[PDB]
Structure 1
């Protein structure tokens, strides 16, 4: 436990932490410049090396963190996250993982404590509401089944499939185009379709308000 104390004083360093945060902001700026095709045509090599650099440094960092923290590291969600977001980035382009790499910019939430407080407030609120979520999901499922067989033969895009009915009922819940776009069309064939979707909007768009209030009191009380 001689060298172990040496890398512990490096890992626990105020410089080390600040150095990591400096790269995250740098890489975040860089990942937004990779958006410009103009910029990329002239600096893709400069950037792709910088991308391969920052990921090695982030890999060294994780390995150090593991030696210093041992099994306590995997008890930490913020570290588990940091782990999975460099592992994703470690797998080569051989093609959607190339896009998930930008999730590493969320380390700026992990690495910055002022941010963790907010996320953790929000995430801890959720298990209390897990029961209302299962009510609405059961409610969606019961109605998604009904709508599939109530309107999916004549309206396949919106209701031809359980998942399609799930998606459309979600859209109705957000109220987006629910009447002009969906229910008025359905009423040219099924004049009583409003007996299905008006009760659905009452229940769901009012249960949601409770789910809203509940979540947004627990977080208020915690902080």
Structure 2
């Protein structure tokens, strides 16, 4: 029987069936969006949900006993378990968030489907080349998120009144979203020297933000 389950899991029909449950449940999860729906067919789908998660457990379990240790060294299956375990967390009570994170089980179409897996892994293999820069940037923010707070948090509490609020406000300034009209120009009505903080921050941040990309294109071309 050891092998009876093996031929099930590795069969193309098995993969076909999982993907079918995905694309179907993918649709129907976006239908519990409609209020009209969750009245006419509302009872219908919370159960169909309970159905699909039940099958995936079997499938994810079938994958377990068939692959033994092969299952738990492959990110896609570890993700499958979590993204199933998430939806395995009870519907009732608990926290409302887990009632929502079930939708992550539609990234299982990135698992169950091979062509996406490559696009994904192609992008992630690129990540490590950046980590030397991402770290500095985080320190850089940290050294700046701190200064902003004790420079501007006094009269501008919402934006800089907290290291957390400064980190948010600094990220937004990095994104350049309303940084001047919304944040800096108001700031200067009180501290006319604010442009010495945020202009250098912006230049440094954008400059460094660029090199990261060339650092990527340089890697592949070299």
Distance in 2, matches of 1:72 and 1:29, equals 31
Tell me by how many angstroms 1:210 deviates: 1.4
Distance in 2, matches of 1:220 and 1:60, equals 45
For each residue in 1:126-171, what CA deviation from the matched residue of structure 2 results, as whole angstroms up to 9, or x when unmatched?
1111110001101000000000001101110000000110000000
The 1:217–1:67 alpha-carbon spacing in structure 2 relative to 1, beyond 3 Å, is farther
For each residue in 1:59-115, what CA deviation from the matched residue of structure 2 results, as whole angstroms up to 9, or x when unmatched?
00011100001111100000000000110101113x100110000000111111100
The 1:45–1:218 alpha-carbon spacing in structure 2 relative to 1, beyond 3 Å, is farther
Distance in 2, matches of 1:109 and 1:218, equals 26
Tell me by how many angstroms 1:20 deviates: 0.2
Tell me by how many angstroms 1:215 deviates: 3.6
Tell me by how many angstroms 1:44 deviates: 1.2
What is the number of residues matched between the two proteins?
218
- What is the root-mean-square deviation in Å for CA atoms of aligned residues? 1.3
Tell me by how many angstroms 1:219 deviates: 6.9
**2:8 maps to 1:10:** yes
Tell me by how many angstroms 1:206 deviates: 1.2
Work out whether residues 85 and 101 of structure 1, in 8 Å CA contact, stay in contact via their aligned partners in 2.
yes
Structure 1, unpaired ranges of 5+: none
Distance in 1, matches of 2:57 and 2:42, equals 22
Q: Report the counterpart of residue 59 of structure 1 in structure 2.
A: 57
Distance in 2, matches of 1:202 and 1:57, equals 53
Structure 2 SS opposite 1:23? helix
Name the TM-score, length of structure 1 as normaliser: 0.95
Distance in 2, matches of 1:154 and 1:190, equals 10
Q: Report the counterpart of residue 172 of structure 1 in structure 2.
A: 173
Work out whether residues 122 and 219 of structure 1, in 8 Å CA contact, stay in contact via their aligned partners in 2.
no
Q: Report the counterpart of residue 79 of structure 2 in structure 1.
A: 81
Name the TM-score, length of structure 2 as normaliser: 0.95
The 1:128–1:161 alpha-carbon spacing in structure 2 relative to 1, beyond 3 Å, is same
Q: Report the counterpart of residue 21 of structure 2 in structure 1.
A: 23
Structure 2, unpaired ranges of 5+: none
Q: Mean alpha-carbon deviation: is it higher for 133-142 or for 40-49?
A: 40-49
